[PDB]
Amino acid sequence: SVQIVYKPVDLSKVTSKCGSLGNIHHKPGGGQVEVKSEKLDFKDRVQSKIGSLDNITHVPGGGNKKIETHKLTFR
Amino acid sequence: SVQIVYKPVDLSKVTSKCGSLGNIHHKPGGGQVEVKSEKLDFKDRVQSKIGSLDNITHVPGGGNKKIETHKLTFR
Amino acid sequence: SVQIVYKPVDLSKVTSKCGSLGNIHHKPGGGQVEVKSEKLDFKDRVQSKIGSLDNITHVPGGGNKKIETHKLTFR
Amino acid sequence: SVQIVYKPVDLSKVTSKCGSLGNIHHKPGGGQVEVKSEKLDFKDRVQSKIGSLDNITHVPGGGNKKIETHKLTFR
Amino acid sequence: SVQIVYKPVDLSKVTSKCGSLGNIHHKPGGGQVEVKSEKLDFKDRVQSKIGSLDNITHVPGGGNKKIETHKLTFR
Amino acid sequence: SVQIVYKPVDLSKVTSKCGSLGNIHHKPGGGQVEVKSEKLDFKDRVQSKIGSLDNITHVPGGGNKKIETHKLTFR
């Protein structure tokens, strides 16, 4: 005579919250710029930014993962 | 005389929240710019931005993953 | 005698939320720009932006995934 | 000069919900019964039930009512 | 020089919810019974139940009532 | 010179919720009974119940009422 009962429960939260979240930015200022760079030789790629304001978020991460591997047996 | 009862439950939440979320941006300012670069030799690509405001959200991430697996076996 | 009962339940949520979400932006300003670049040699492509405001989202990510494997076996 | 405008609006709900409503009943059981009553005198009626399961509703009530009286009068 | 404007509004809800409402009854059990009552003298009615399960909802109530009344009078 | 304006608003809820509401009953048990009552004399009505489970609701009440009595006059 045997009885077996298997009823596991998952109620968990796995969560990520990444970047610029929930800020208040009120009346931000800015400013003025020049470039006169001259005769220049670049052997490879040039990357440049000449903003007044930069307001930025960059999120390579935050990739949650869950794994769940259940088993039972008799004989 | 055997009984086996198998009723596992997933009620979990797996969640990502990524970037510029829920911010308040009240009256952002700006500004003014010049470039005069001259006689130049770029042997490979130029990437350039000359914005007044830049407001940006880049998200290569946030990619959730769930694996779930179940088994039962008699003899 | 044998009895086997198999009723696994998935009621979970898997979710992503990526980019510029739910922000409030009130009266954003801007500005003015010049370029005079001269005699230039570009041996490969120029990628350039000369906007006043740029407001941007770019989501290569946020890509959810699920796997759910089930089995039962007698003899 | 006179002006009179009369536009009363009834958009209310009056509702009753009475008895065995919206229940979920999964696998109810039952059982076994005997009576041997003997030499009996009943000078008035026997009302009797010998069921195994009885599942029952009886609603002498739930009877809604409304009254809505309107009037206007000049001189 | 007179103006009278009469536009009363009823948007209310009046509601009764009475009995066995929204219950979940999972696997109710039962049982077994005998009566042998003998040489009896019932001078007025016998009312009897000999069930295994009895599940019941009697609702003489829940009877809503709305009265609404309106008047206007000039001279 | 006169103006009169009459626009009362009812957005209320009057509500009753009476009996066995929203329970979960999971695997209820039961049991076993005898009556052998003998030679009995009843001068008036006999009421008897010999259940194993009794699960019951009885609601004489819950009968909501609303009353609303509006008036206006000039001279």
| Residues 7-46 of chain A whose Cβ lies under 8 A from any Cβ of chain B | 7-46
Q: Do chains A and E touch (3 or more CB pairs under 8 A)?
A: no
Q: Considering only CA atoms, which of F7, E23, E52, F20 is closest in space to residue D9?
A: F7
Contacts C69 to A, Cβ<8 Å: none
Helices (H) and strands (E) in chain B, counts: 0, 10
What resolution does the deposited structure have, in angstroms?
3.8
- In whole angstroms, what separates CA F46 from the centre of its chain? 26
**Any alpha helices (H) in D1-75, and if so which ranges?**
none
- The neighbour count for residue C28, using CB atoms within 10 Å, is 17
Q: Which residue of E has its CA nearest to D10?
A: E10
**Do chains F and D touch, with touching meaning 3 or more CB–CB pairs less than 8 Å apart?**
yes
CB D8 within 8 A of CB E71: no
The phi and psi torsions of D32 (rounded to 5 degrees) equal: -125, 145
**Hunting for tokens 């120029």 — which residue is that?**
C46
CA pair distance D73, E72, nearest whole angstrom: 7
- C67-70 long-range contacts (CB < 8 A, ≥24 apart) are C67/B66, C67/B67, C67/B68, C67/B69, C68/B66, C68/B68, C68/B69, C68/C10, C69/B68, C69/B69, C69/B70, C70/B70, C70/B71, C70/C8
Give the residue from chain B lying closest to C39, CA to CA.
B39
Q: Which amino acid is at E32?
A: Q
Instruction: Tell me the residues of chain D between 51 and 70 that have a Cβ less than 8 Å away from chain F.
Output: 61
Q: Do the Cβ atoms of B63 and C59 come within 8 Å?
A: no
Greatest Cα pair distance, chain D, in angstroms, is 93
Tokens found for residue F55: 């699960």
| Spatial separation of the C-alpha atoms in residues B22 and F20, rounded to whole Å | 44
- What's CA F8's distance to the chain center, in Å? 32
CA atoms of C40 and C36, how far apart (whole Å): 11
Method of determination is cryo-EM
Record the tokens describing residue F48, joined without a space.
């008897």
